[PDB]
Amino acid sequence: MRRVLVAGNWKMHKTPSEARVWFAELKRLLPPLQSEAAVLPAFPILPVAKEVLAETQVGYGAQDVSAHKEGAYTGEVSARMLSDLGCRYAIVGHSERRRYHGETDALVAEKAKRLLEEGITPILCVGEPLEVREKGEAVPYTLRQLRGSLEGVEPPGPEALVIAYEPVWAIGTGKNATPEDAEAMHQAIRKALSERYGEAFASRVRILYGGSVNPKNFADLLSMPNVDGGLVGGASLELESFLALLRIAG
Amino acid sequence: MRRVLVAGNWKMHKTPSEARVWFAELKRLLPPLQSEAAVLPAFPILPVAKEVLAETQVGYGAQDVSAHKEGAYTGEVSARMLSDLGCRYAIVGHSERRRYHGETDALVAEKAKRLLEEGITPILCVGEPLEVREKGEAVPYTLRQLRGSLEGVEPPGPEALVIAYEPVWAIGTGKNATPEDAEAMHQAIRKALSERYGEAFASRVRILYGGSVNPKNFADLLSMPNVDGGLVGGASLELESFLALLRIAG
Ligand code: NA
Ligand code: NA
């Protein structure tokens, strides 16, 4: 069975000083767990994440990364910077960046390649907008996004790639996809991965569900055969909530 | 007179571990100077900048910042995060972001506002492309960018705002604007600032020149009455080069 992954996307919240406290509390309170936990804070919080969590079972990663290895790209952060900090993951193609920053499938693929080269696992996000869902095109749209975002992306193994299905209409709206609909989409995604990398590879890739995941609905979502964890937004900000999610994962 | 400012924009280079060494060497080799020095590294390098440069005369800052205070903006860094780290500055509207990230004057204005609220000084970049310069419209174009980028931007005082004039054609091309052309542009910019904030304010605002600034041309650029320092790109990557620029500033 695929090991569960609970990744907390703090988005643009907290300061480095506030994060130090949060991480220290998590370290002291963290019980022994079989599943995998990871926190994905803003760029300037990564150093303290490394400092406080490096020796714990809790991993960490970035919320974005440059499509370039280095250069005249003011404001951008490179994969080499992230690997120097020991990031295990980095989100690429999050809905918010595809929407607010015009990130294309092609750009997301490049970012994924930069991460792979440095041994960082991309958490590649795909998901359809409400309009597409209502027209009954959720699966074709999401698969098209997945294939486009994986163009030229060839991970060393299934452990080096994570896919996160986050329907846009489920982000911060309180309206999560039902476990059944999530399961159906993950099945489609996994089949697409099998065609892309082979069955052995696809059967081992962790596919997380994201979009209003919380302590009240996580257990049922995680019970779905093809749902391997969650990309948690709002519910990862409060330590008690994050811990509750980790206990559910076990 | 206006205190000179030499700000090094490393763009996307180095790692936190490499920066720790660089900053520590700068700290040990830094001679007493009248002018102000600042280094602007990538986001994840800011914590070590704070650690090593805290007690020194060298300031530091970011290369970008979110237009929002906080929220669901995956990948973005807030002004509050930068304030927590003691950043004195943050670049906004760098030509690379206006081009590669489609940043508009309106967006840049919001970023500047976020910085002001947190007591961080924006280093607002404005500049024209080669064809505009050749058409003899460098000033009108640049002033329009300045005015749009300062919409709703009301600093507490002139010490809280820095303008950087960087001709797009002078970035990484090796061809810096002549001291005469830079002076002419800075005069136009300062006059615009006077109409916007009054003469007392405008006469105290530091207007830096950027675009292929190096040890060979910095002295003459700095000699111009309205050029108050430089936003240094490639020439700020090597410590010896940065130190040379600081010695020139005095
Ligand atoms: Na499951
Ligand atoms: Na001068």
Domain ranges of chain B: 1-250
Q: What letter represents residue B154's amino acid?
A: E
CA distance B202 to B200: 6
Tokens 């992954």 belong to residue: A5
Tell me how far CA of residue B40 lies from CA of A96, A106, B82, B160, B230, in angstroms: 26, 30, 12, 17, 13
Experimentally determined by: X-ray
Tokens 């020796």 belong to residue: A55
Of B16, B71, B171, the CB nearest to A12: B71
Touching check for B81 and chain A: CB below 8 Å? yes
Pull the structure tokens for residue A47. Answer: 């150093």
Q: What is B1-250's CATH number?
A: 3.20.20.70
CA distance B172 to A231: 40
Pull the structure tokens for residue A70. Answer: 């280095």
First to last CA, chain A: 14
Touching check for B84 and chain A: CB below 8 Å? yes
Pull the structure tokens for residue A190. Answer: 């996994």
The burial class, CB within 10 Å (0-12 / 13-18 / 19+), for A34 is exposed
Other Cβ atoms less than 10 A from the Cβ of B141: the count is 16
User: Which three-class secondary structure state does DSSP give residue A45?
Assistant: helix
CB B63 within 8 A of CB B76: no
CA distance A37 to A22: 14
Report phi then psi at B213, rounded to 5.
Answer: -75, 135
Report phi then psi at A120, rounded to 5.
Answer: -100, 140
Instruction: Provide the resolution (angstroms).
Output: 1.6
Tokens 């609220």 belong to residue: B117
CB A231 within 8 A of CB A204: no
Q: How far is B2 from chain A (nearest CA, A)?
A: 27
A227: CA distance to ligand 1 center in Å?
A: 4
User: Angle at which helices A138-149 and A105-117 pack, to 10 degrees?
Assistant: 50
What's chain A's Rg over C-alpha atoms?
A: 17
Touching check for B90 and chain A: CB below 8 Å? no
Give the residue from chain B lying closest to A63, CA to CA: B75
Backbone CA torsion sign across A235, A239, A243, A246: positive
CA distance B226 to A75: 27
CA distance B69 to B72: 10
- Name the region of B75 (left: φ>0; alpha: ψ -120 to 50; beta: rest): left
Give the residue from chain A lying closest to B99, CA to CA: A73
| Exposure class string for A83-93: b at 16+ Cβ within 10 A, else e | bbbebbbbbbb
What's chain B's Rg over C-alpha atoms?
A: 17
The burial class, CB within 10 Å (0-12 / 13-18 / 19+), for A143 is middle
Quick check: B74 and A68 CB within 8 A? no
CA distance A28 to A109: 38
